[PDB]
Design a protein around this ligand. Structure first.
Ligand SMILES: *[C@@H]1O[C@H](CO)[C@@H](O[C@@H]2O[C@H](CO)[C@@H](O[C@@H]3O[C@H](CO[C@@H]4O[C@H](CO)[C@@H](O)[C@H](O)[C@@H]4O)[C@@H](O)[C@H](O[C@H]4O[C@H](CO)[C@@H](O)[C@H](O)[C@@H]4O)[C@@H]3O)[C@H](O)[C@H]2NC(C)=O)[C@H](O)[C@H]1NC(C)=O
Ligand SMILES: *[C@@H]1O[C@H](CO)[C@@H](O[C@@H]2O[C@H](CO)[C@@H](O[C@@H]3O[C@H](CO[C@H]4O[C@H](CO)[C@@H](O)[C@H](O)[C@@H]4O)[C@@H](O)[C@H](O[C@H]4O[C@H](CO)[C@@H](O)[C@H](O)[C@@H]4O)[C@@H]3O)[C@H](O)[C@H]2NC(C)=O)[C@H](O)[C@H]1NC(C)=O
Ligand SMILES: *[C@@H]1O[C@H](CO)[C@@H](O[C@@H]2O[C@H](CO)[C@@H](O[C@@H]3O[C@H](CO[C@H]4O[C@H](CO)[C@@H](O)[C@H](O)[C@@H]4O)[C@@H](O)[C@H](O[C@H]4O[C@H](CO)[C@@H](O)[C@H](O)[C@@H]4O)[C@@H]3O)[C@H](O)[C@H]2NC(C)=O)[C@H](O)[C@H]1NC(C)=O
Ligand SMILES: *[C@@H]1O[C@H](CO)[C@@H](O[C@@H]2O[C@H](CO)[C@@H](O[C@@H]3O[C@H](CO)[C@@H](O)[C@H](O)[C@@H]3O)[C@H](O)[C@H]2NC(C)=O)[C@H](O)[C@H]1NC(C)=O
Ligand SMILES: *[C@@H]1O[C@H](CO)[C@@H](O[C@H]2O[C@H](CO)[C@@H](O)[C@H](O)[C@H]2NC(C)=O)[C@H](O)[C@H]1NC(C)=O
Ligand SMILES: *[C@@H]1O[C@H](CO)[C@@H](O)[C@H](O)[C@H]1NC(C)=O
Ligand SMILES: *[C@@H]1O[C@H](CO)[C@@H](O)[C@H](O)[C@H]1NC(C)=O
Ligand SMILES: *[C@@H]1O[C@H](CO)[C@@H](O)[C@H](O)[C@H]1NC(C)=O
Ligand SMILES: *[C@H]1O[C@H](CO)[C@@H](O)[C@H](O)[C@H]1NC(C)=O
Ligand SMILES: *[C@H]1O[C@H](CO)[C@@H](O)[C@H](O)[C@H]1NC(C)=O
Ligand SMILES: *[C@H]1O[C@H](CO)[C@@H](O)[C@H](O)[C@H]1NC(C)=O
Lengths: 319, 172, 172, 318, 172, 319
């Protein structure tokens, strides 16, 4: 008797996928939803970026020698590398990580001179073999190491005031020097009890030099720690000090917004990406990703899974 | 499965049908033929494409780093961040699995439903000129040449044109 | 769609049907007549009502502010908070989109099914006294005046009563 | 004779999204994201306090602008932009933690310290920075202790608040940082300044920064505030000799309240459980696109203008 | 329901049936009998067992404490943590409700489909020998004893035997 | 007329569960997805655990007497109890909660000797009523209260340095004594002004004993506030001081990883769990849990639902 029969296609070996009710369902086809592959490069096409190489973001503001080409500029993407240098003279910044993040959320840095001057009783031009430029001794480009001009004398009580006449807030930084011995402290500031006060309309604080023997770092047992604050438009900030201040010769203004990336991957200007990680860039259209929980940009969501395949065909029912 | 057709009363698929997802096999006096149905095939593919289109679509949210790669985070804030990131990861991992399992099921059932819809469509065209063998075919009680076969696939088979005879053949 | 009826073997909806979701149109010597079916219409409405009710009641969880509107937040904790709220926002946006796409598919499919179950219910009522159009109609093989059409709509049609007469007509 | 089955339809359908289709036409649908807000603060059903020009911290220390908000009870506290905490210029260590704490409370009680002072102390120090009755005045809950004799070394003194209550008490105090040595000398004398503050669950020392800084509200000095909790049965002692702004009352925070920050106007004729900077969100809808910063019981914020849910079958017109 | 059978064209369930989930009742000359159907019973059971095994899958993320039980946490970080935990809990509570609401619908409907796939199976065996009750029964137009009824139950019934007899009876 | 009928089973009392469209759907069987049940017990089988008892983790590092059995050790699971003791002589640690959590992430504690020694006018073993060992007086086992050998004598200027010669970092602690009265100060350390400076290659600070009457705690009006830092491998750390330092005899090395639990629930060595909370242990195969939003280990997710039932049968349709 004559016949017409209905049916569907099948393939030789299907692809296994998961369902609600079955861990081992066979279908005629499937495609991956978890991205396991990365490009081992920072994809910078379409971006105004600054590769800081050797310079740590904080060194941009205080003017460490490794940061000379990064003292000002604009960018929509800022790239920090491992082991970068902030401090040539050994020290540390209070609230360091908050400061680094702030620099790395920014789109640029301007510099504005403080205008500070000093009597011929103060000497402001001192340098150190720990901070070197042009084969010679130097110092943080944006600050100055004030000491007494005639050794051993009590450093004069001094007032220096910076005035934000702009319409945006400025970030001001200063250092406090912590000598490694009593004689050292006396040689460069005198025998008097030292004090450094710092006041604006929205901030004040005092600082006294810790003196004591400690290990040499980059040849120095002394230390200079950094401090910072934001000075609002129309506000002034005054420094009263009689020894131990490392005074700013310039202040900074962070401009706009940018994306901060920490990675040692090399720059490629001929690919684009919106998602970066320590190892490179992630350019996938896929919704998920198992490369790293630490990503930046606009990124597929991190998942704990090697693979999750989505069926693109019917049940496979082979002959 | 749900619609009882694929992996159902149709026992298996045809590996020799590379030009479509669903289709026909006939047997008449002039022999044997196979042919895909373009319409049913495209209804299943277009549903898949809609799924894929929906799956690649982007959340535009821009995230910054809250963890340094090259320096150590204060211990307490570090633990809050780790706790939070791991919780967020458990949520997305669960969603991803659930999404893909759920869609896989629906893809399957939808493919099944298109097979059933094609079959039902044929059943009604033929009307009283054929009967169901249970395995997915219609035993036809009248001479249907390749051109008549092509009408059924063409969806222009007019059961009136063959009825009086087919009733004779069925009740005989 | 899934059940082959709405946007399937029924070619289009009836804009004329103002008083119901599903119903019957007839064609006899006495004329046309449209009439909604109460039970089918009601079964589809109640299920939607159910969806709606489930989707109002929202979390009684009471949240406090972790961000000053009127003063600045220390930068590091500010960034953690931002990262957390944005991740939360991405989760909810995605849930919401999925929820609504998913329920929309289920609502469409549930309406398709109700249409089919009406067609099926009637098919069995009519038994051997009618045949199917393939377009959603049943060609009745006896004189079915307005009283007879009404009994079909009201579930009070006895196939025995017109059977013979129909069994005669179908064999010409 | 012929009977046909069918479904209804409309002329102008509605577009919704599905799993499989961006542009699905249905007979009907309705919105699931709230886009509207009431530009008012819906306070019906609530024992609420409008702080007006008073900043929460100011209610603990007693700034003149907080005179009407030094005690009370409430289930809802409303802070406005530009509220004043400090008449004499200064800052509070862990300021935002304290603000949130006061804004998590259902009211405040004030309890007296009891402290008294020998006669070589003037404890009624006032300033034109804090005017009350158009007199020079001070933070109502603290006293600016100075030497009654200009130039006189403020005496070594001790003061101990004992909590006899059955609930911990919030105690605040200040340290005065003068603008100059002369001001330091005139007020506290010429000796070096130490202030100590210990309970059995808190310990800490303080010394007065002296330096030039710009005038705020006419003043170059600063008072900065510190705060801790004294547990029931516990003591907190102050040893000091100059520059302590000592408390005359400690605070006790009562129950729970919802804190709101908004400048929208109060309205006692609507109810709400969800608030934001722009006002009040009264939806039954589960989602909301107004702001990711809300407080109370709220729809969840989503990054979507609209999400329409199907309330009807697929629309297939003629 | 979606496939129109359970609480559908079939009016209610059989408490008498303990030996399975789906099955048969008959009436012949030798009386009446009840019996389960293996296939569809296990097909349903297995899909349920399948969902359960998915439900107890061990998310193995190890989480530490970010809140001291025996000491007070700084109030600001404490508020951030509470906000984070309470938001994380709203997500999980909402997914949990949704997961279960959804699986329960899918379970209900899957069961409704297995009932229907069985009925469609018997119908196609009977071919032209029986007609549909419409209450889920098949009226058989020839004498069908216990061996005849077992043959049906076990997919061993041949319509070719009883065809011409059944056709006598249907028309008269 | 013969007839065969198809059907499905039912039962006389079904279960209510929730569907998408119906809060009150009756089905034949169902099962719970939210765990409401806890074991009032710390399930410790297959763990090498340390119950600290009344020892507080910070007491492990300074060597309070309550902690004398927990000075060193190893474990994968450390259990802290309520009201455990850290300070016999009253005081407090800076960054106290951060340190506690570090100890509770840890898998053991090794002690290493500082090899600090002192001149003959120092009494390197001050003891106190508040730190009882064996009845009589004693002191923190891992630290040394330094005072003058002669009551009113000026305590001498002094310098000690710990050298880390190991391949991992060591955690070093010390204290600062704030005397109760100016006569205590002078008893212990003489009449000079006192200054203690600490410096590593990663850390410095100064500290000044402040005299001041405070409420008595374990009989003592004085206090010792405690400080800590990490000393990196190959690095040294120098203390300079003339009265008021509490110096370290040993430093600690944190070993590996462990899970930290806070609970007064009793240990049971016969049951195992991977999820813990204040009230004990939770082992359930269920995916959700309503006992507490504060759990540690590998856990079902907390939800705010008493009950959630998953259907395990079809719709129930009685007669
Ligand atoms: C982050 O979130 C946590 C968790 O919600 C908050 O901690 C809870 O709130 C506070 C913590 O500071 C505690 O509130 C009070 O708890 C008393 C508990 O006393 C007993 O414990 C248990 C239950 O915890 C019960 O068996 C008995 O009731 C015990 O007595 C409780 O009695 C008290 O209520 C009463 O207090 C006032 C006086 O202030 C009375 O006048 C009034 O009648 C009232 O009923 C409080 O509820 C609470 O215990 C904490 N719970 C937990 C699990 O920690 C944190 O505070 C949040 N952090 C921040 C920064 O907001
Ligand atoms: C928040 O969460 C992060 C992410 O987990 C934690 O950071 C990890 O901390 C662990 C230690 O708990 C680190 O693991 C250790 O690393 C050594 C391997 O070197 C790694 O070095 C780089 C970084 O420079 C890594 O990125 C890279 O993957 C390398 O593998 C191992 O040798 C350690 O195991 C050994 O430890 C002891 C010594 O203490 C040995 O004696 C034993 O033999 C043992 O095997 C261990 O695996 C891990 O690298 C860190 N990851 C990252 C990405 O930083 C944070 O600490 C956590 N925050 C808080 C506050 O807890
Ligand atoms: C955690 O996230 C919050 C919310 O996103 C961040 O706060 C926002 O921060 C951005 C700055 O990066 C602010 O954007 C600014 O808008 C200004 C306009 O004034 C607005 O002020 C109020 C708040 O007081 C807004 O709500 C309102 O819409 C007003 O319109 C711009 O003028 C700002 O800078 C501009 O600088 C130059 C001018 O020369 C312009 O060319 C630039 O385009 C640039 O826009 C700036 O854009 C925004 O106001 C903040 N929003 C809120 C709600 O506070 C936090 O900072 C974030 N924290 C982080 C990363 O630490
Ligand atoms: C920050 O520093 C600036 C500069 O010292 C301060 O601005 C001063 O503001 C005063 C009043 O606020 C002004 O003086 C007035 O204007 C004229 C100027 O000749 C004078 O004749 C009037 O009698 C009156 O004194 C002036 O603009 C300016 N003064 C000076 C000397 O520069 C500012 O107040 C400081 N602090 C801030 C802004 O917080
Ligand atoms: C810590 O102290 C030691 C002890 O003096 C320092 O010097 C030792 O290590 C050097 C490695 O560069 C050796 O070359 C020295 O000879 C050695 N001296 C000894 C053992 O007496 C060591 O450099 C110091 N480390 C730091 C970071 O300052
Ligand atoms: C349908 O297919 C047949 C195959 O022979 C062809 O003859 C016919 O033209 C087709 N009909 C129409 C209307 O396209
Ligand atoms: C229609 O039948 C119903 C029962 O289905 C009955 O209640 C009603 O009276 C009947 N109406 C008409 C018009 O026959
Ligand atoms: C504190 O209060 C008084 C004196 O201040 C004292 O008698 C009492 O014993 C002390 N109690 C505590 C708990 O310190
Ligand atoms: C799956 O591969 C098959 C080849 O058999 C093809 O139909 C389809 O292109 C593939 N899926 C996708 C998403 O390309
Ligand atoms: C959707 O609108 C149509 C026509 O106004 C109506 O059928 C239905 O009631 C509406 N939905 C709701 C929730 O009111
Ligand atoms: C449901 O209960 C029935 C009998 O009451 C039993 O057969 C089945 O195993 C149960 N399943 C569960 C509780 O998961």
């Amino acid at each position: 008797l004559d016949k017409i029969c209905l049916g569907h296609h099948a393939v030789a070996n299907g692809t296994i996928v998961k369902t609600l009710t079955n861990e081992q369902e066979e279908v005629t086809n499937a495609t991956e939803t978890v991205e396991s592959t990365s490009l081992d490069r920072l994809c910078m096409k379409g971006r105004s970026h600054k590769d800081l190489g050797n310079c740590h973001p904080i060194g941009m503001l205080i003017g460490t020698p490794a940061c000379d080409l990064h003292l000002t500029g604009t960018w929509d993407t800022l790239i920090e590398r491992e082991n970068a240098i902030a401090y040539c003279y050994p020290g540390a910044t209070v609230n360091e990580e908050a400061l680094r993040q702030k620099i790395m959320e920014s789109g640029g840095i301007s510099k504005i001179s403080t205008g500070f001057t000093y009597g011929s009783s103060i000497n402001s031009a001192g340098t150190t073999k720990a901070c070197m430029r042009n084969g010679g001794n130097s110092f943080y480009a944006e600050l100055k190491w004030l000491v007494s001009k005639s050794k051993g004398q009590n450093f004069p009580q001094t007032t220096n005031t910076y005035r934000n006449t702009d319409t945006a807030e400025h970030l001001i930084m200063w250092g406090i020097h912590h000598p490694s011995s009593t004689q050292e402290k006396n040689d460069l500031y005198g025998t008097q009890s030292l004090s450094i006060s710092v006041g604006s309309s929205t901030y004040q604080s005092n600082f006294v030099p810790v003196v004591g023997a400690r290990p040499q770092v980059n040849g120095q047992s002394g230390r200079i720690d950094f401090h910072w604050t934001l000075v609002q438009p129309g506000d002034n900030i005054t420094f009263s000090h009689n020894g131990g201040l490392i005074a700013p010769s310039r202040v900074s203004k962070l401009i706009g917004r940018g994306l901060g990336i920490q990675s040692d991957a090399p720059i490629d200007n001929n690919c684009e990406s919106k998602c970066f990680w320590r190892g490179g860039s992630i350019n996938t259209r896929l919704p998920f990703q198992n490369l790293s929980p630490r990503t930046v940009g606009q990124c597929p969501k991190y998942v704990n899974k090697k693979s999750l395949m989505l069926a693109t065909g019917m049940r496979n029912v082979p002959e | 499965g749900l619609f009882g057709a694929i992996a159902g009363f149709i026992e298996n698929g045809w590996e020799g049908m590379v030009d479509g997802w669903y289709g026909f096999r006939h047997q008449n006096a002039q022999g044997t033929g196979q042919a895909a149905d373009y319409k049913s095939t495209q209804a299943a593919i277009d549903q898949i494409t809609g799924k894929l289109n929906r799956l690649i679509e982007k959340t535009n949210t821009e995230f910054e780093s809250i963890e340094s790669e090259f320096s150590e985070i204060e211990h307490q804030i570090g633990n809050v961040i780790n706790w939070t990131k791991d919780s967020i990861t458990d949520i997305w991992t669960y969603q991803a699995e659930l999404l893909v399992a759920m869609e896989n099921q629906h893809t399957i059932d939808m493919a099944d439903s298109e097979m059933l819809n094609l079959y039902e469509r044929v059943r009604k065209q033929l009307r009283q000129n054929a009967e169901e063998d249970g395995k997915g075919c219609f035993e036809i009680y009248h001479a249907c040449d390749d051109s008549c076969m092509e009408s059924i696939r063409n969806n222009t088979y007019d059961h009136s044109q063959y009825r009086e005879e087919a009733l004779l053949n069925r009740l005989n």
